[PDB]
Scaffold this active site. Structure first.
Site, PDB file in Angstrom:
ATOM      1  NE  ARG E   1       3.786   3.273  -8.861  1.00  0.00           N
ATOM      2  CZ  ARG E   1       4.139   2.881  -7.591  1.00  0.00           C
ATOM      3  NH1 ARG E   1       4.556   1.633  -7.344  1.00  0.00           N
ATOM      4  NH2 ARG E   1       3.639   3.670  -6.614  1.00  0.00           N
TER       5      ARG E   1
ATOM      6  CD  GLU G 702      -3.076   7.077  -2.370  1.00  0.00           C
ATOM      7  OE1 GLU G 702      -2.226   7.214  -1.903  1.00  0.00           O
ATOM      8  OE2 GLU G 702      -4.100   7.763  -2.397  1.00  0.00           O
ATOM      9  CG  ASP G 703       1.933   2.604  -4.207  1.00  0.00           C
ATOM     10  OD1 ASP G 703       1.470   2.414  -5.387  1.00  0.00           O
ATOM     11  OD2 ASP G 703       2.522   3.710  -3.877  1.00  0.00           O
ATOM     12  CB  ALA G 704      -1.800  -1.081   0.846  1.00  0.00           C
TER      13      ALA G 704
END
Ligand SMILES: Nc1nc2c(ncn2[C@@H]2O[C@H](COP(=O)(O)OP(=O)(O)OP(=O)(O)O)[C@@H](O)[C@H]2O)c(=O)[nH]1
Ligand SMILES: Nc1ncnc2c1ncn2[C@@H]1O[C@H](COP(=O)(O)OP(=O)(O)OP(=O)(O)O)C[C@H]1O
Ligand SMILES: [Mg+2]
Ligand SMILES: [Zn+2]
Lengths: 298, 422, 149, 125, 99, 54, 739, 50
Positions: E1, G702-704
RNA sequence: UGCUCGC
């Protein structure tokens, strides 16, 4: 892979031009089995792939050339005795483009689907001079239909296939040898194969309908397989060949390429319930009630 | 870039002010003119100007088709009627040019005749565009319609006397609704009938080659001396700009121009309300040098007080009697008392402690902060310092005002010691 | 189009050379470089964009089109085909992007978003059609694939 | 035909030749004056209110400036739309209520446009 | 990102909570990295946010420094308690007897 | 080319009279006989010798 | 509520019935007054907006009007007679919240930081989104489905909107309109509109050789038929005219008359004819044909996404149209009641006062604001989703939703043509702020520093244009339109005239606008490709303030900023002193703007005030947004619209159906200047936590993220959810009640 | 999935035959590879590759 | 039915 496909751009396949629909629109056009597709591509192989002169010659043979594209000036001269249109062919540009077109070929090009021009109207005076003297047809037409000719006289085809719109000379730069092929943005495969100097045995096309109509149903199946595999590889994603083979066989098992749309699905399937559930519920149900077609549960 | 040469004079003539017309042919280039074409007549109306020229065209010239002329003449008129014929002979001989009105008012347009060292201007009474009118085809269509009616009547060789007596079909003069009456008034047929109500005026044509042209051409000039000072046309540029551009008709809402349009007292009051801290020289510069200093001083003495040579707006000006603290809701009198105490502390010493003021005035932190921010800035390790430096020049220049402000501050200090028990 | 291709080639040369220089100057144990080598997340292109230089912003495989008359933004001259005036982003994400570069990047992001938005529905319809057409076939025991009939 | 300029136009009209010429100039809506005893109001002041005699001067400065000094203010004169169709300036004089005379005064070829120098009027006050 | 802005915000917030200031993250501007690095080095902390950290589980120091700093986290309305759903036999619709 | 009648301004067509070809208008007896040769060239764009790509 | 309503009342001041003449109902003056509640028996009472929120009622003010009428031919006047109820927008001129101190806000149980500007109907908060639409009375050259490059013009007046098109389907130009059975050649319409000579038509179209070559087929097709006069062309047009399903009334040979009326009134409504003089309309259609001919070569097709041709309708224009429709319906109902009652009732003279129903306008306004669907039969406008429920998730949520803008596309399909981010959105709309999902690109937000213009009088504009040397179009033929140096000057789609040396005209107009004699919102632009000078004065246009730069030095100096800081001057003083001026999209298309001082070059006309003003309100919360990716900024805006936190100072007395509050909210340490401007630090929606970026236990794949138990135990992230349960005990028709 | 708020469904078969068919045909260990090209989808991911 | 959202 349709969701995996990004619908990218700039993939000119090495020619930096000739924008071709690739990706989900291409897969949709393939599975719909439409007779006319967007941006049709025809690859033609040459007997003399090393000579550029022969390549340009066969290109001029296959590519449609209008009269205004080769004539240097067209002038409507009104002499005191008679009025007529004089067209001057640019022989220099003719020999530059290597087109086998002279005054006689131009004269033969006229009198074909042009308000029924009589052969005596068109005449040749010099080596590259064409004189057209139209006459009143009496069907709401007078001598001042000359202007009408001025609207469509340069737009007559003198050499090449009318369906062919643009043909380019693609080159392969293999280390062993650089060979020449024809990339035709037309919708007439039979005419391209029938032209002189084109190795019709190794000529392919993107439009599945033309391949089906010209070289049989098996050639259409092979073209579908190759085109789907190429479109899939263009996006970097791989599919096992058995899936596309099964798809092509299902599309080409009744002797005719039938699309995945409602029409092809109705022509292939027989079950009334599935046809009603997919699309056109009321129409299919009423037609089945009229025919009294018994539907099994197979 | 000075006017080196060509100092041409401009004269005005009113002889042909009401008799000057401009005829322009949008379809005829300037190369070919109508000087050689013999004209026959000109119809015109004084009001609602619309001139129709009727000219004659030759026939023996090779550029004329006599067969088509006979054809169009037989089409427009009858066989040998000749009672109302658009052409005298059996050929198209007369041509009609119709005029269209460009604009209603032509006062801003003028014709300029240039002579050696002078330019004479003459107003235009009207401007019309002359175009070849197609009016014979309408009469031809009407005659074709009447010939069709005659052919319909002639279906039988002998027509019996028709008992087609006109039954009395007198229609009601219905009271027309105002909307339908307005529609009828705005209809094209009504306007055309109103235009046709005005009678026509016939005029002869005098070409450029005629001696009358050169005779009347001199009327565009005016008898007058070379150098004459015009009585009018003497308005200043500002007056001209006002003429050609006539007018249509937080507390900082009023702008600088709207401020300057107000009286001096209101200007001083609004400036002291907005800035709340400003020297006398800055106020004189903002108000303008054209205002006397004594008037500005008298105005500022009523809405401001003297603190360390500077002027600070009074407490009651910022907080009216009906206002209240936006942070605590206390009455404006307490805010005025606190601000007066702060200003007195500033007059006594340049450095003011926020905690001491909060303790003495018993006010909240936000009110004291707002009181200090209006006239002080935060200096680290020193507290709050007055935003403007000590202005001794104004003090030296006006000692009487200093003494007046000193006795006023003495009275305010007495009041504050009575209230807060200092 | 030849000039456009040459300018794109030069900007890509700048981008790739800056990326190679950044990869060569980077020391080991660097978490972005470590995650790029193992392929867990990211790549060398993202590292070059966020460290060395952001690449040319491409809309539909081309430079930023002229939204205004003969120019993309009024901040540039008319008929100006300079790289910075057509989408090039000289600065990186670390140094910060100029307002024009940020606007071009937002344009590219919105183009990608609308592309994905159209792709979702288009592929959904295509999948529905394909499954409704192909759901009848089945592999029999005689090694012959036959339809329902 | 190259686009001429008013300064060179007048120069060739007076220096190169001496023949008179008929011009058609467009004056602004309101002239910088007052209607003299015309029973008024700051209304429009056109040529119909002004009297005969000298009303202004025409100045030709350097670098092609063509101004019209009509008193205290100065307008600027530029070339109008280059008309190529026939324009005949005629005099239609209705001497009698039943018969009138139409007098062809001449031909119109060039058109001038007079405009207020708004920049000077603004920088003045 | 490529969210370098998050790292810059973390560094600026750490510098601010160290020196008692509120740094600005204004678009196309704001406090530069050099200023917050000088603010960190002045207070005795690392000029890059990475600090020596000992693992709480094993009690041994980590081989790589950890990027610590105050970040402005905001909780969203999407909760698992409101989104948790389980369906028994339950009711059915009158027209079509389905859930 | 496009020609117009000086009389009324309508478009002129080419017809044949009793002596010679002439321009004529359909709304007026105006005619114009042709004396010398009249021509109107257009010079259409010549297709260039396209380059061989690949 | 202060100007437009009076104009609407004046437009329908007198209403009368056809039967029994000399009877009339005349409106004199209409007032809206202060908001009140009809709870008390025949008595009004001041009510606060919070009370309307609690009692599930509407916050409206009684629309009254003074009138005069005739009962029995005797004039009877009423000085104060209520006729409806207008819902009062919060923080408006008549709203009770304006001119109040935060202490007085606390007395009224209203947050001082509340943005306001939303209506309160039946207890719910509705916001009218800013509508975006194409500009009216503008020629649009576009390609058709078959690739034919045609033209379209939607001439819209105060009464009728008519979109007429022109096509080249067969090498000749046909004009298509909804009032014609079949499209007719343009030359026939030219001959019908007064100009009969073909040479004049060709001169008006253009004198270029290619223009004549393209227009030749049209002339030939016209000469094929026998149409050569105005009467023949009008008859041919009337033959192609179909009656509007047996219009009431005797026609009496109206064919040619119907054709002429359609040409004068229905076709090209925005182009006015003085008295059946189609000269301006002829010039307009000739310019349109010339534009089509020029576009038929080089593909210079105008784009719809260019925001210079976009117009923004606020709540004011929508409410004006709605009030006009409701007042016309009320007048028609009153006229019908009069016609039914007066001629047959009794010697007891009928008066409108006994029949003036006051619930009509009130119910219409309430329904249109609440349901959000607007059906205007007088304008045939059927819109939906005009009003939306104000989101009270957080202060940022409401503040960002208040500045939302919806698209005319009204998303139902994948257009992917307006969803793109056009460069025209610079400084006007936020590029990053957009709802992620199906509404991506069609729902947008205004920038931090932007303004929407209103309508002007358009009088002094015409006066200055006429005084600046603009020659009248009726004085010259169309051939001058083909000259390379002649530039057309327009005005709101109407051909204002022609001009030479347009640089002087533009400079003088801009200098006059800076001086103050012309409104600062009047925009002027120049298109050299089409050689057209556009003068825009209609409302809804987006404008942005810019510092004027003259000779490589900005007009704004340090002394002016010091005076502004000390309070000597305000922004209006900067506007009046020719220091900062508003630029429109069309105007800034021709101007040169510099981002910073160092970027200023010789060819610079304006200077950017502040670059970070490009972002909107939601995007302003992002710390260092130029260091992140644009999808990250979009997702951050979308999530901040859903961020949990305090709503206002009156969040405790407020009772909503769903409210989320934070136990210990903290202001951010890295705050943008936009945060200080919008006062977000007073109402934070998050907490600062000591985050360590590392991998731990593999529960953050994942994004946690991994949270600390001790932190959550000490109040970190603690939240409160408030729900509302409402019940009603209503009395029925029978004398029984819920107990 | 990406664990950023995704909601997933969980169904319980009410038949032994359906349960056995689900466990056999749709077992996680029996569907480690996609039928598209045979590539394994259930494999290591971020924070497992690093 | 409308609309704002969640991926
Ligand atoms: N305007 C409006 N229409 C609704 C609403 N609810 C349902 N409809 C309409 O009814 C249709 C769908 O009906 P359902 O939502 O299934 O009705 P339901 O929930 O079964 O009704 P109950 O049995 O009373 O719960 C849609 O086509 C809508 O037009 C509503 O709240 N407002
Ligand atoms: N309209 C939709 N149809 C199907 N799935 C959707 C839809 N919207 C969201 N999803 C789900 O959310 C996922 C989309 O995430 P993806 O687009 O891959 O990352 P992203 O939203 O671009 O995040 P970044 O912006 O890259 O940080 C994939 C899909 O299962
Ligand atoms: Mg997700
Ligand atoms: Zn003619």
């Amino acid at each position: 892979p349709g969701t995996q496909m990004t619908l990218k751009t700039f993939h000119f396949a090495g020619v930096a031009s000739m924008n071709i629909t690739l990706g989900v629109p291409r897969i949709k056009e393939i599975i719909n089995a439409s007779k006319a597709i967007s941006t049709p591509i025809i690859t033609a192989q040459l007997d003399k792939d090393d000579d550029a002169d022969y390549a340009r010659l066969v290109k001029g043979r296959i590519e449609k050339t209008l009269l205004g594209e080769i004539s240097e000036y067209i002038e409507e001269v009104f002499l005191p005795d008679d009025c007529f249109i004089l067209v001057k062919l640019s022989l220099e540009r003719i020999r530059l483009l290597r087109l086998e077109v002279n005054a006689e070929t131009v004269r033969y090009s006229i009198c074909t689907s042009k308000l029924r021009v009589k052969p005596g109207d068109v005449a040749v005076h010099g080596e590259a001079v064409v004189c057209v003297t139209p006459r009143e047809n009496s069907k709401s037409s007078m001598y001042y239909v000359l202007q009408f000719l001025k609207e469509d006289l340069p737009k007559v085809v003198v050499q090449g296939i009318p369906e062919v719109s643009r043909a380019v000379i693609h080159i392969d730069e293999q280390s062993g040898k650089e060979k020449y092929k024809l990339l035709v943005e037309g919708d007439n495969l039979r005419a391209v194969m029938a032209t002189h100097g084109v190795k019709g045995t190794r000529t392919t096309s993107n439009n599945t309908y033309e391949v089906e109509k010209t070289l049989g149903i098996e050639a259409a199946r092979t073209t579908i397989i190759n085109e789907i595999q190429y479109t899939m590889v263009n996006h970097g994603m791989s599919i096992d060949r058995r899936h596309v083979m099964l798809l092509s066989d299902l599309m080409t098992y009744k002797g005719e390429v039938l699309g995945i749309t409602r029409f092809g699905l109705a022509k292939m399937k027989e079950s009334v319930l599935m046809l009603a559930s997919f699309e056109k519920t009321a129409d299919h149900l009423f037609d089945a009630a009229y025919f009294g077609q018994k539907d099994s549960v197979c | 870039d000075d006017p080196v040469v060509q100092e041409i004079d401009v004269y005005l003539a009113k002889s042909l002010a009401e008799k000057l017309y401009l005829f322009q042919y949008p379809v005829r280039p300037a190369s070919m003119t109508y000087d050689d074409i013999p004209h026959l007549s000109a119809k015109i109306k004084p009001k609602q100007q619309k001139v129709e020229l009727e000219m004659a065209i030759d026939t023996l010239n090779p550029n004329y088709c006599r067969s088509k002329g006979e054809q169009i003449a037989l089409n427009v008129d009858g066989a040998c009627a000749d009672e109302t014929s658009t052409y005298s002979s059996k050929l198209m001989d007369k041509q009609t040019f119709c005029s269209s009105q460009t604009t209603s008012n032509t006062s801003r347009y003028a014709a300029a005749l240039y002579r050696q060292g002078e330019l004479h201007l003459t107003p235009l009474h009207g401007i019309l565009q002359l175009r070849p009118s197609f009016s014979y085809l309408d009469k031809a269509d009407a005659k074709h319609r009447e010939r069709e009616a005659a052919n319909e009547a002639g279906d039988s060789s002998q027509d019996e006397a028709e008992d087609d007596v006109k039954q009395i079909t007198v229609r009601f003069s219905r009271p027309e609704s105002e909307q339908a009456r307005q529609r009828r008034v705005q209809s094209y047929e009504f306007l055309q009938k109103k235009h046709a109500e005005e009678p026509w005026v016939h005029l002869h044509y005098y070409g450029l080659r005629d001696s009358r042209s050169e005779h009347e051409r001199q009327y565009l000039l005016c008898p007058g001396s070379s150098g004459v000072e015009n009585t009018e046309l003497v308005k200043s540029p500002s007056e001209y700009l006002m003429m050609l551009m006539p007018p249509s008709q937080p507390s900082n809402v009023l702008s600088m121009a709207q401020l300057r349009t107000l009286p001096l007292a209101d200007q001083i009051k609004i400036l002291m309300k907005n800035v709340k801290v400003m020297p006398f020289a800055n106020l004189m510069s903002l108000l303008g040098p054209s205002i006397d200093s004594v008037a500005v001083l008298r105005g500022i003495q009523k809405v401001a007080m003297l603190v360390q040579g500077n002027w600070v707006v009074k407490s009651d000006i910022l907080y009216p009697k009906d206002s209240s603290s936006p942070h605590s809701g206390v009455p404006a009198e307490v805010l005025c008392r606190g601000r007066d105490f702060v200003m007195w502390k500033f007059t006594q010493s340049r450095w003011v402690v926020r905690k001491e003021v909060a303790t003495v005035t018993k006010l909240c932190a936000e009110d004291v902060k707002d009181f200090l921010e209006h006239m002080a800035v935060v200096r680290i390790n020193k507290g709050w310092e007055f935003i403007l430096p000590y202005d001794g020049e104004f003090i030296k220049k006006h000692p009487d005002v200093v003494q007046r402000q000193h006795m006023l501050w003495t009275g305010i200090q007495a009041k504050l010691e009575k209230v807060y028990n200092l | 189009e030849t000039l456009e291709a040459l300018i794109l080639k030069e900007l890509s040369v700048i981008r790739d050379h800056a990326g190679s220089a950044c990869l060569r100057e980077l020391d080991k144990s660097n978490s972005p470089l470590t995650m790029a080598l193992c392929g867990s997340k990211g790549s060398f292109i993202n590292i070059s964009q966020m460290i060395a230089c952001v690449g040319q912003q491409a809309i539909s495989g081309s430079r930023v089109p002229d939204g205004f008359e003969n120019r993309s933004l009024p901040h540039f001259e008319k008929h100006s085909k300079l790289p910075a005036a057509k989408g090039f982003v000289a600065n990186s994400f670390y140094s910060g992007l100029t307002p024009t570069e940020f606007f071009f990047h937002t344009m590219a992001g919105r183009e990608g978003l609308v592309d994905t938005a159209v792709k979702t529905a288009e592929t959904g319809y295509m999948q529905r059609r394909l499954v409704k057409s192909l759901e009848d076939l089945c592999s029999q025991y005689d090694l012959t694939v036959r339809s329902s009939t | 035909l190259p686009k001429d300029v008013s300064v060179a136009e007048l120069l060739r009209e007076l220096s190169l030749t001496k023949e008179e010429e008929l011009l058609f100039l467009q004056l602004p809506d309101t002239l910088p004056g007052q209607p003299p005893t015309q029973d008024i109001a700051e209304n429009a002041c056109t040529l119909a209110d002004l009297t005969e005699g000298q009303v202004g001067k025409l100045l030709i400065r350097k670098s092609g400036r063509v101004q019209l000094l009509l008193g205290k203010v100065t307008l600027d004169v530029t070339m109008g739309t280059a008309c190529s169709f026939l324009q005949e300036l005629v005099s239609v004089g209705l001497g009698d209520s039943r018969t009138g005379e139409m007098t062809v005064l001449g031909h119109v070829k060039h058109k001038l446009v007079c405009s207020p120098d708004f920049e000077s009027l603004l920088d003045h006050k | 990102r490529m969210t370098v802005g998050k790292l810059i915000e973390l560094l600026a917030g750490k510098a601010g909570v160290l020196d008692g200031r509120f740094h600005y993250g204004t678009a196309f501007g704001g406090s530069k990295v050099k200023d917050v690095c000088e603010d960190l080095v002045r207070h005795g902390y690392n000029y890059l946010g990475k600090d020596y950290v000992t693992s709480g589980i094993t009690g041994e120091p980590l081989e790589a420094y950890i990027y610590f700093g105050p970040v402005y986290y905001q909780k969203l309305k999407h909760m698992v308690l409101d989104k948790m759903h389980a369906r028994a036999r339950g009711p059915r619709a009158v027209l079509t007897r389905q859930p | 080319m496009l020609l117009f009648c000086p009389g009324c301004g309508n478009g002129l067509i080419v017809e044949e009279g009793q002596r010679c070809h002439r321009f004529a208008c359909n709304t007026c007896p105006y005619v114009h006989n042709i004396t010398r040769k009249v021509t109107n060239r257009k010079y259409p764009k010549l297709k260039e010798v396209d380059d061989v790509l690949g | 509520i202060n100007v437009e309503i009076k104009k609407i009342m004046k437009a329908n001041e007198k209403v009368t019935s056809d039967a029994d003449p000399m009877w009339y109902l005349k409106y004199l003056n209409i007032y809206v007054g202060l908001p009140d509640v009809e709870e008390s028996f025949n008595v009004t009472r001041p009510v606060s907006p919070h009370e309307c929120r609690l009692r599930d009622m509407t916050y409206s003010a009684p629309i009254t009007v003074d009138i005069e009428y005739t009962r029995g031919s005797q004039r009877i006047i009423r000085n104060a007679l209520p006729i409806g109820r207008m819902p009062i927008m919060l923080r408006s001129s008549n709203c009770v919240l304006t001119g109040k101190t935060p202490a007085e806000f606390a007395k009224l149980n209203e947050c001082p930081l509340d943005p306001g500007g939303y209506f309160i109907v039946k207890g719910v908060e509705k916001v009218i989104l800013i509508q975006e639409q194409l500009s009216k009375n503008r020629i649009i050259v576009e390609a058709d489905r078959k690739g034919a490059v045609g033209a379209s013009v939607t001439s819209s007046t105060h009464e009728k909107k008519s979109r007429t098109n022109m096509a080249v389907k067969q090498g000749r130009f046909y004009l298509r309109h909804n009032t014609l059975s079949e499209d007719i050649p343009i030359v026939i319409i030219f001959k019908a509109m007064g100009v009969e000579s073909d040479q004049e038509i060709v001169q008006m179209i253009g004198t270029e050789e290619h223009v004549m070559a393209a227009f030749g087929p049209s002339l030939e097709e016209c000469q094929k038929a026998q149409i050569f006069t105005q009467m023949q062309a009008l008859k041919y047009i009337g033959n192609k005219v179909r009656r509007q399903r047996m219009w009431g009334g005797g026609p009496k040979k109206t064919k040619i008359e119907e054709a002429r009326e359609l040409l004068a009134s229905t076709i090209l409504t925005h182009v006015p004819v003085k008295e059946f003089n189609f000269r301006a309309k002829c010039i307009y259609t000739a310019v349109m044909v010339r534009r089509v001919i020029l576009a038929q070569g080089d593909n210079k097709v105008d784009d719809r996404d260019y925001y210079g041709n976009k117009r923004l309708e606020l709540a004011g224009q929508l409410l004006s149209l709605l009030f006009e429709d409701l007042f016309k319906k009320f007048n028609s109902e009153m006229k019908k009641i009069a016609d039914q009652v007066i001629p047959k009732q009794r010697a007891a003279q009928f008066d409108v006062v006994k029949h003036m129903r006051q619930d009509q306008i009130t119910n219409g306004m309430v329904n249109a604001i609440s349901t959000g669907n607007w059906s205007l039969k007088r304008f045939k406008m059927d819109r939906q989703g005009v009003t939306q429920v104000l989101s009270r998730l957080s202060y940022i949520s409401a503040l960002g939703m208040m500045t939302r803008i919806s698209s005319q596309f009204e998303k139902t399909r994948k257009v992917s043509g307006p969803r793109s981010l056009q460069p025209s959105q610079w400084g006007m709309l936020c590029p990053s702020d957009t709802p992620e999902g199906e509404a991506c690109g069609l729902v947008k937000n205004l920038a931090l520093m932007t303004h929407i213009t209103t309508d002007m009088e358009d009088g002094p504009i015409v006066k200055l244009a006429s005084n600046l040397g603009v020659e009248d179009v009726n004085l010259l033929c169309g051939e001058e339109l083909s000259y390379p140096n002649v530039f057309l000057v327009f005005l709101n789609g109407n051909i204002l005239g022609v001009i030479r040396d347009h640089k002087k005209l533009v400079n003088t107009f801009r200098l006059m606008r800076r001086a103050g004699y012309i409104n600062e919102f009047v925009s002027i632009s120049t298109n050299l490709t089409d050689r057209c000078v556009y003068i825009s004065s209609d409302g809804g246009r987006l404008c942005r303030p810019y510092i004027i730069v003259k000779k490589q030095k900005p007009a704004v100096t340090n002394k002016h900023m010091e005076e502004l800081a000390q309070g000597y001057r305000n922004f209006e003083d900067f506007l009046h002193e020719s220091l900062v001026e508003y630029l429109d999209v069309n105007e800034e298309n021709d101007c040169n703007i510099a981002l910073y001082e160092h970027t200023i070059n010789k060819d610079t006309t304006h200077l950017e005030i502040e670059p970070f003003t490009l972002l909107g309100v939601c995007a302003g919360l992002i710390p260092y947004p130029h260091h992140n990716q644009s999808p990250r900024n979009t997702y951050q805006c979308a999530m901040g619209k859903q961020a949990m936190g305090t709503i206002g100072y009156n969040q405790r007395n407020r009772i909503d159906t769903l409210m989320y509050l934070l136990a210990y909210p903290q202001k951010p340490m890295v705050k943008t200047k936009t945060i200080e401007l919008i006062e977000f630090e007073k109402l934070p929606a998050g907490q600062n936590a000591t985050v360590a970026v590392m991998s731990y236990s593999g529960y953050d794949i994942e994004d946690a993220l991994v949270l600390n138990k001790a932190s959550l135990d000490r109040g970190f992230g603690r939240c409160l959810v408030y729900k509302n349960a409402k019940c009603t005990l209503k009395r029925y028709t029978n004398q029984t009640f819920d107990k | 999935a990406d664990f950023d708020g995704d909601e997933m469904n969980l169904h319980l078969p009410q038949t032994e035959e359906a349960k056995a068919e689900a466990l056999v045909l749709m077992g996680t260990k029996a569907n480690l590879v996609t039928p598209r090209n045979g590539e394994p989808l259930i494999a290591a991911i971020q924070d497992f590759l690093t």
